[PDB]
Structures are given as C-alpha cells and as structure tokens.
Amino acid sequence: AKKIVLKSSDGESFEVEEAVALESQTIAHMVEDDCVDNGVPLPNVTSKILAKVIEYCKRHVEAAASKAEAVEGAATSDDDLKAWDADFMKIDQATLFELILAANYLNIKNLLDLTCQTVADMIKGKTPEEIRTTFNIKNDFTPEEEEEVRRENQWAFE
Amino acid sequence: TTALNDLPDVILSNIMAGVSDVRSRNSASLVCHKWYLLERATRSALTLRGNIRDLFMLPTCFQSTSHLDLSLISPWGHPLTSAADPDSALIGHLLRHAFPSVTSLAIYARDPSTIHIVVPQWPDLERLKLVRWHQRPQTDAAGDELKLLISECGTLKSLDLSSFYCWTDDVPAALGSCPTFAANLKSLNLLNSSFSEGFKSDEIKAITKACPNLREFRASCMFDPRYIGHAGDEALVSISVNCPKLEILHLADTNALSSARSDFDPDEREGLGQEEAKINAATLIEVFSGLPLLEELALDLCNNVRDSGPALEVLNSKCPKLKSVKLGQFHGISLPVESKLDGIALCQGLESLSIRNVDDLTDMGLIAIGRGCYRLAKFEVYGCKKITVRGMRTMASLLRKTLVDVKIAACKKLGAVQSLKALEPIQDRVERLHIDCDWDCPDDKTWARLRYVSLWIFVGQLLTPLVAAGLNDCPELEEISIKVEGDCRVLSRPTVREFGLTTLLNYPKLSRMHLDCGDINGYAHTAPSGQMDLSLWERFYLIGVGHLGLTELNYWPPQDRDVNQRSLSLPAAGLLQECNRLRKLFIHGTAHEHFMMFFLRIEGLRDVQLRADYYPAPEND
C-alpha cells in the first residue's frame, strides 16, 4: 500500500498510510507536487498535536472502512466512534485550542467540527462571568451597555 | 498559551454556531463586544417574546436570524395586525426592518389581514407555518384567505398547516387556484388533529394532483368507510402516482391524531372501528412500488387492514431508503412459520418502528421483528393483547446494541412492572422510555442513560408505586411527562389525599415536567355527593409540586366538556405559586388575571404564558 511521511515543525517524522492522510484536504493538496515523496512539511503543527490528529484520522478511516465491510449487526462502532470521540476530547484547554488550530490548518472538517462543538458544549450552562473566568476574557461592557443587551435579549423566548 | 479569543474569527463563528440553547446564547452575548457581535451575527432562530403593544421597541440587532416565530407573542392568539387599526401596516414594515434575512416564518393567523400584511414583507420566504386555534372566519368561498396567502407568497417551498384550523375544502381550492404555487411546493403539512373530518378521497386527489414536486406529504384523512367520500384505495393510488418523489408520507385518521386514547383505541370506542378500511394488500403493494424514494412511512388508521404482511414485504425491496415505519391497526404484521421471516421483519433498514393495535402479534412475531429489524433504535408498541414479557424481553435482548427509545402502552399482559422487567437487557442503555402506570397486572439496576420518561395513568390512580415498579435508580433522569386521562364524573372520591408527585423526589436530576391533565372529564363546580369537582382533582394532582426542584413546567388543567372550560383554579394556582425554582411555566388553558399576577411573585420566573393551543380556543380574550 502507498505510505507517506509527514514532517512536524520540530523535525519529527510520522510514517502513515496514504489514504488516512487523504483526510486532510491541505495534505491532499500538497500531494500534487513532488513533496508527496520528498516528505510533506508541516511548519505550523507540533509533534503531539500531529500525533493526535493522525490518531483521530486513523480511527475514522479504519472504522469507516470497517463499516465499508461487515454483514449484519456489526456497525456498533458508530457509537464507539462517538464514545471514543467523547473520551478523546477529554484533553486540557491548551491542547484543545492547538487541536482546533491544526484542524483549521489541515482542513479536516470532521475534527474541526468536533472540537468546535466541544468548545460550544463547554460554553453551555454558564453565566457571562463564568464564561469570562473559564476562557480568561476581560469584560469591556459598561453597565448601561449590559442593560441594553439584556433588554434586547428579553425579546427572545428561552 | 493560546486563549480562546486569539482564535480566528471563522473558528469563533463556528464555535458560536454550536450554541443552540437560547439561554446560553443570551449569556454569551454578554461576555464582551466581540462575543456580542459573534452571537448576533450567528443567531439563526428567534421566537419573539413580548407584547404586541410594545412592537415599536423591537430590537434591530437580530439581522442574521433566518427563522422567525411570531406565534407566541403576547397576548397569546391575539391578532398581530388588524386592518381596522390605522397604523397596522407600519407594524409589518417594522418587522422587515428588524429581521431582513427571514426565510422561515411561523405566525398566528387569527385575522386574514395579519397574513396579508406580514407575509409579503419577505419575498424570499421559503417556509411558512400558520397557527390558528380559534374559529375560522366566515368567508364567501372556501380557501379565500389561503388564496390571498398564495397570492402574496409565490416562492414558498414549504407550507405547514398542522396547527392551522380551517375547513378541509379550503386547501384544495387554494392549491388549484394557482398552479405555479402548488408546483413549487416541496413539503405540505396538513396533519391537523382539529379537523372535524379528515380530507376526503377527492380532496386528497386534487391536492396531490396540484402538487407534483412534493417531498413531504402529511395529511389527516377520513379512512372510515361509514361516511361518504372516505379516503380509500384510489386515494392511495393517486398519492403514489401524482407524487412519485415523496420522501415522507404521513397519512393518519383524524381520530388517530387525538390526544385522548378514548378517541382512537378500538377497545375504548363503543363498537366503533372494528371494521375493515377500504385498503387492500395488493393496492398497498402498488403504492409502495410507486414510491422508490420513500424514507419515512406512517399509515395510522382507525380501521383495520388485515393480512398486510405481503404488502410490507414489498417495502424492503421497493423502498431501499425506508428507515422509519409507523403503522396503525395494520394486522398480519409478523406471522412467522418455522423460522422464516416475513412482513415487517423483512425490512432490515428500519431504524424506527411504531406498532399499534395488532391482534395477530404474538411473542414469536415480536421476536421475529427483533431478529429481522436488527437496526432498530426506536420501538413503539400500542395495544397488543397477546404479547408477553417473555417476547418483549427477548426482543430487547436481541436489540440491546441499538435500542434506546422504547414505548409500551395499552398492552393487557404488559403492565408497569412487566414493562420495566422486559426492558432489563437495555436497562443501562435505554435513553427514552414510556410505560403505562398499570399497577394491578397479575404476575445492576441503574438506569444509567435514561434521560426522559413518559407516563400514562388513569384518573384517580396513585403515582407512589412507580419506584416499587422498577424505576428506582435513574441518575440522569431530567424530564418526566405524565399524562392523565379518564372520566372522573363516575369515579368516587379517592381515599388518599395526594396523587403522589413527591415520589418524583426519588430522582435527583429531574428538572422539567409535563403534567397533562387535559383529558380528565369531570364536574366544574357541582359534583354530586361522594364526588369531587375539578378544583379538588387539581389539588389532588398538584399537591407536592412545590417540593420538586422543577425549572420548567407545562401544565394542562382538566376540562369540563359540558361547560367547555379548561380553567386554572384558585387551589391549583396557589399550589403552583409554591414553585420558587420555576424558570418557565406554560399553562394550556384559561386562568383568571389575578392567577397570572400571582406567578410574577416568583423571582426567577422568566417565561410565563397562557396558551390555549386546543380547538376551539376561547374567544373571550
């Protein structure tokens, strides 16, 4: 089978299958030139982030293919992918943001969507002060502006 | 380390788009100016909250919302715009200024002038939902206001009249008035329970002929062969022929859409039903052969269709994309011989299956369905006399890898204890559940994923045995819906003081409740000796609701049919006033204005509304 190597920003090299690397639209794009065989360089991805990225991609392509196969009562991975996605996203905030940035770089739509939804779920059920504390955001709203925004928000059924 | 705010604006918009809960959106809009702009440019759905008299103070910040819901504006059901009012047209202009990007609209259509003034404000509108529970205004001809709407809503792709009261003669006349409007329709929802009689065969034929490009068709029809013009064999053939591109076909008898189980259950009806509908298996084969793109099928009839197994076998081959099936009073669903699968058991692509009133269904048939439909995630069975906890448990074990939403209702041999025992294999996996609170049926343990429980109970019965029935440890149970039905004009006064809502204190995460007592029939004020009036029944059912830490409550007061009132009483309002934790409270009925002033005493109560969403809605407002 065709295999490709990816070079992280810190010089590390990861050897992986071509098909799983095809998930990243950016990598698929640089495939067009000679760097497909000379080694695709990723100046904006670190070793740990790249390892997490190709782990997620490998699991998705595998279970994908796995589901491309099987005969009856065997797609139970669908939940597993989920359950595995849920336990995979149990990472610290900094690694989460780096994973988001790497997904935006490599243009892996599924991973980017999953990480953004993880952030959105982290948002749910928190007051503005709680959100500011969790994400370290400074409040630039004057009290009059806060009351105006609240008055606007009173026009929406909750 | 990188913080969230240093992320690119595209990523921030993607993150904000994932916040679907409106409260969290309101919270996030207050974090900072950048977050305010992101939330306002990202919000897509808005249900307008406020008073009609305050429409001039309408906010202009929601410029990106594509779905607008104007049906819940206060006072509920009031004409949003009246032609008699001189500055009515300005109101429409205001709306177009506040929400210029609306493509989906839901409005209350009490007055035709409201439609004529509001709907044409968005020429790019593609989905429309009309709501009306009040009486249909008198018109010279059928479909006059619908014809007006068609005139001002040319580019509409979806029309939703499932909560819009009108005569069934209105729809075909309006559709045939303008062929180009009907040709552009992709979805047509006419599944209205409030229709006195469903669409006739000729009306169905005209509707389907007018709209050839429908992907979704839902309608409440007249399938009872007693009446003249009942929908039958030719209506189904015409539906199949005229709309080959249907992806969803939901045809139901009007009585089947009623909330009261006495209206569709053949046992509860006093000899009604029990006869064959004018539907044959061969014609069902013909219809299913003509709908290759079908993905959802629902045929909920109030009359019997027997030996339908061969017809359902054709569904597996001729409808590869079929994932959901809902059948009502279809017989011969699964009649396995030796080990061969047949009928609905052949449909291996089913993800949801609803079964109602199948006399032939035994334990062997249920196990055959479980074997053949190995992909079932939702299963619903109603009124099957011959099925037993053995067969239901075997089916649950066979489907333990996918089954997450189970409903067992009106099963003679399956009570509350029986149902909870039968759901043992999926006890740790089931997420949504419905059981009937039948306590007199003659016969580790943690519900880890159970998030929603639906209960049906007869009037005068207690809720206390529920924990003894098997629903002991439900850590994740957040929402419970209780429906009470029965005629208490013949019931004696109960010997116990309270219904037993305090039993729900056994579940720590319970925060949302639906208490639907609207199908209780009793005496408003003049209960004879040995009986109690509706206020006393409201006390009996609502005692202890204050001790529950509920944040949302939907309550349906019991109704007196003779006086035609669904009123919230003094004792019931006093009991509801004890709920200090309520965030949202919706009463489906009428109440005195002092009663509504009572509830504003609650500090955290944000959304309060009296919603008479039943037919006919009171005109006293």
Side-chain angles (χ1 to χ4, degrees):
Chain A
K2 293 179 179 179
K3 293 179 179 179
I4 197 171
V5 175
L6 302 322
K7 293 179 179 179
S8 295
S9 68
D10 289 345
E12 198 153 342
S13 64
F14 285 75
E15 293 177 350
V16 175
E17 153 61 30
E18 183 178 2
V20 55
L22 177 63
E23 295 302 320
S24 163
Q25 278 213 9
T26 59
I27 291 170
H29 213 310
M30 302 152 282
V31 167
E32 183 178 2
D33 289 345
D34 76 311
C35 289
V36 56
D37 276 16
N38 293 94
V40 196
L42 300 194
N44 318 283
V45 187
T46 67
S47 283
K48 187 158 53 47
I49 300 320
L50 196 289
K52 259 170 185 305
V53 164
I54 49 72
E55 171 188 352
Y56 171 96
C57 291
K58 212 150 41 56
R59 193 137 173 51
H60 268 253
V61 298
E62 66 89 3
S66 178
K67 259 358 102 216
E69 293 177 350
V71 43
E72 191 259 64
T76 190
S77 82
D78 192 294
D79 199 64
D80 289 345
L81 295 174
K82 301 301 290 187
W84 176 84
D85 277 352
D87 54 66
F88 173 35
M89 299 294 344
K90 192 76 35 64
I91 37 173
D92 49 74
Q93 195 181 110
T95 307
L96 188 269
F97 289 164
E98 306 291 342
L99 192 49
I100 273 160
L101 267 157
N104 176 83
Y105 183 14
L106 305 191
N107 262 60
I108 312 144
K109 183 178 179 180
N110 311 305
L111 171 79
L112 189 61
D113 292 8
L114 157 78
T115 48
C116 288
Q117 193 56 48
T118 302
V119 183
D121 297 341
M122 271 168 21
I123 279 274
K124 251 194 67 146
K126 285 176 183 53
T127 78
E129 197 63 37
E130 281 176 72
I131 299 166
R132 278 195 288 264
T133 290
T134 54
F135 291 120
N136 188 266
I137 310 167
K138 299 298 303 321
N139 189 6
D140 45 270
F141 270 128
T142 71
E144 292 79 15
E145 282 170 326
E146 285 181 2
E147 279 301 318
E148 174 64 35
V149 169
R150 290 215 184 72
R151 172 209 101 71
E152 290 175 338
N153 289 348
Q154 295 299 305
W155 278 92
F157 259 114
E158 164 178 304
Chain B
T1 53
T2 167
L4 168 49
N5 253 109
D6 324 297
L7 280 199
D9 269 39
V10 152
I11 300 333
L12 289 184
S13 295
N14 231 55
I15 289 165
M16 213 60 70
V19 199
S20 48
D21 174 68
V22 181
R23 189 178 176 185
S24 37
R25 292 201 71 86
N26 290 352
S27 298
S29 69
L30 284 156
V31 170
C32 69
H33 275 86
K34 189 192 187 166
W35 277 50
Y36 171 87
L37 301 154
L38 288 167
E39 201 283 297
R40 297 298 201 241
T42 288
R43 192 180 286 222
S44 61
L46 193 86
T47 305
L48 207 61
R49 169 182 178 261
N51 220 278
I52 296 158
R53 89 179 94 99
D54 297 344
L55 268 198
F56 288 83
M57 329 294 138
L58 196 67
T60 51
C61 54
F62 303 118
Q63 305 280 274
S64 288
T65 54
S66 49
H67 169 80
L68 182 62
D69 195 352
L70 298 182
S71 68
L72 294 181
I73 202 179
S74 287
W76 186 93
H78 263 236
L80 158 56
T81 278
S82 43
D85 196 283
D87 40 315
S88 278
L90 275 295
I91 276 183
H93 212 84
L94 275 66
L95 286 163
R96 204 228 320 259
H97 191 73
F99 317 102
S101 311
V102 163
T103 70
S104 181
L105 179 70
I107 200 170
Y108 202 94
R110 189 152 179 186
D111 261 352
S113 51
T114 290
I115 287 175
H116 168 68
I117 289 161
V118 173
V119 170
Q121 296 293 335
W122 295 283
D124 289 334
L125 196 84
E126 68 192 49
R127 306 169 58 71
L128 181 61
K129 180 176 180 67
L130 293 184
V131 186
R132 179 167 75 201
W133 302 92
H134 292 96
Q135 287 295 349
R136 177 199 175 264
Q138 270 319 331
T139 38
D140 322 78
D144 280 325
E145 78 248 28
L146 278 187
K147 273 197 274 229
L148 293 182
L149 170 88
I150 267 71
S151 71
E152 311 106 23
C153 215
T155 318
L156 201 69
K157 267 154 31 154
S158 172
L159 186 60
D160 192 359
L161 309 181
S162 62
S163 308
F164 184 70
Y165 181 79
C166 52
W167 294 347
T168 60
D169 321 64
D170 292 316
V171 186
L175 293 181
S177 167
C178 200
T180 172
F181 174 91
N184 284 2
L185 279 183
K186 306 291 283 150
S187 154
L188 186 65
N189 202 343
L190 307 166
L191 197 73
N192 204 341
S193 59
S194 317
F195 291 152
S196 36
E197 42 154 307
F199 288 95
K200 302 196 198 85
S201 189
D202 301 288
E203 296 171 304
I204 284 154
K205 288 198 199 82
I207 283 166
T208 46
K209 168 69 81 212
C211 312
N213 299 312
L214 283 180
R215 310 187 354 260
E216 200 221 42
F217 183 57
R218 311 193 200 250
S220 57
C221 312
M222 181 194 346
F223 288 114
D224 205 324
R226 304 207 262 82
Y227 310 113
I228 315 300
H230 60 271
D233 260 317
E234 307 181 4
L236 295 187
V237 167
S238 325
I239 290 168
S240 66
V241 161
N242 289 328
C243 309
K245 286 146 67 164
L246 277 181
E247 281 161 36
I248 302 177
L249 180 59
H250 193 135
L251 303 175
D253 196 279
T254 281
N255 285 266
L257 298 181
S258 203
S259 43
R261 273 149 73 136
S262 65
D263 285 8
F264 61 84
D265 203 343
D267 301 1
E268 303 295 296
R269 308 228 263 159
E270 300 308 332
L272 289 185
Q274 311 288 354
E275 47 183 297
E276 280 258 346
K278 294 291 159 266
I279 318 285
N280 279 285
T283 325
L284 283 179
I285 295 165
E286 188 186 355
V287 168
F288 298 154
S289 304
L291 296 175
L293 296 181
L294 205 72
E295 314 198 358
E296 201 215 278
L297 176 69
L299 302 155
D300 212 303
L301 321 184
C302 270
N303 293 90
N304 300 297
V305 175
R306 281 178 164 97
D307 308 332
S308 59
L312 301 178
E313 290 186 15
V314 177
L315 270 173
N316 195 42
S317 46
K318 289 284 167 288
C319 299
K321 303 260 268 293
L322 182 76
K323 301 217 141 305
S324 178
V325 158
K326 173 170 194 264
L327 299 172
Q329 278 184 236
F330 274 64
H331 289 67
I333 299 308
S334 179
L335 297 165
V337 317
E338 284 105 40
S339 61
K340 271 203 45 52
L341 295 180
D342 74 73
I344 209 74
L346 292 214
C347 296
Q348 34 66 54
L350 286 192
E351 285 164 358
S352 174
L353 175 66
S354 316
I355 280 303
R356 174 168 77 85
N357 288 129
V358 186
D359 292 312
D360 289 345
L361 189 73
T362 51
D363 284 34
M364 284 342 281
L366 212 54
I367 298 162
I369 295 163
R371 247 198 304 286
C373 303
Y374 55 87
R375 251 181 285 255
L376 275 183
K378 173 196 254 209
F379 182 59
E380 180 169 335
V381 57
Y382 185 99
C384 292
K385 302 206 154 273
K386 288 195 223 332
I387 57 169
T388 290
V389 59
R390 220 194 44 74
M392 193 72 242
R393 182 155 36 76
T394 306
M395 199 220 198
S397 77
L398 282 158
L399 290 168
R400 88 201 308 310
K401 277 190 290 323
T402 59
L403 200 58
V404 287
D405 173 348
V406 188
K407 168 156 176 263
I408 299 163
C411 289
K412 212 204 55 66
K413 296 188 180 31
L414 276 156
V417 188
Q418 294 300 320
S419 316
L420 296 183
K421 231 167 271 297
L423 292 192
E424 187 227 321
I426 59 164
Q427 184 155 345
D428 45 294
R429 217 87 57 101
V430 64
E431 290 172 351
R432 302 180 50 104
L433 168 57
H434 177 105
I435 58 152
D436 284 8
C437 299
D438 184 346
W439 311 126
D440 60 15
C441 198
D443 85 321
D444 186 23
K445 294 168 213 66
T446 299
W447 302 82
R449 313 278 324 261
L450 186 60
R451 266 186 326 284
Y452 175 85
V453 161
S454 178
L455 293 174
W456 184 91
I457 192 161
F458 199 70
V459 66
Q461 293 289 336
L462 307 186
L463 194 68
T464 50
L466 187 65
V467 185
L471 271 190
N472 196 11
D473 205 33
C474 315
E476 293 298 295
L477 183 50
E478 304 161 11
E479 190 175 36
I480 193 172
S481 155
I482 299 162
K483 178 146 172 77
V484 191
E485 179 175 339
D487 217 302
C488 53
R489 282 170 319 167
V490 315
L491 270 289
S492 55
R493 187 190 281 252
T495 89
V496 190
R497 172 201 181 201
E498 50 145 20
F499 169 56
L501 277 187
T502 38
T503 308
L504 302 186
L505 285 172
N506 189 282
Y507 314 111
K509 260 194 196 174
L510 176 69
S511 62
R512 307 191 294 284
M513 205 177 76
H514 302 248
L515 192 66
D516 192 348
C517 287
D519 279 323
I520 296 176
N521 212 91
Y523 284 121
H525 30 63
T526 171
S529 183
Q531 323 204 345
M532 38 168 33
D533 63 295
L534 283 179
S535 314
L536 270 297
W537 280 113
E538 277 200 283
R539 271 200 84 257
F540 169 83
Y541 276 112
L542 276 172
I543 271 165
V545 77
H547 306 155
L548 304 177
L550 303 176
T551 61
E552 314 191 14
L553 180 69
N554 285 72
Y555 178 63
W556 305 62
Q559 60 176 310
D560 193 304
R561 228 89 65 61
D562 302 299
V563 175
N564 174 101
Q565 61 140 72
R566 318 200 188 200
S567 64
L568 186 67
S569 72
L570 201 280
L575 276 161
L576 296 178
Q577 200 212 301
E578 311 293 347
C579 305
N580 46 318
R581 291 265 272 310
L582 274 184
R583 176 90 170 164
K584 295 183 269 199
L585 171 72
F586 306 116
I587 304 282
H588 300 274
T590 51
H592 195 34
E593 290 67 14
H594 296 178
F595 297 154
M596 284 345 273
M597 214 69 46
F598 271 11
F599 301 127
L600 294 214
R601 202 84 46 227
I602 314 193
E603 265 323 278
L605 197 57
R606 192 192 182 259
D607 302 324
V608 175
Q609 202 168 45
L610 289 178
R611 301 177 169 165
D613 49 2
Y614 44 76
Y615 180 78
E619 298 265 328
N620 310 88
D621 61 339

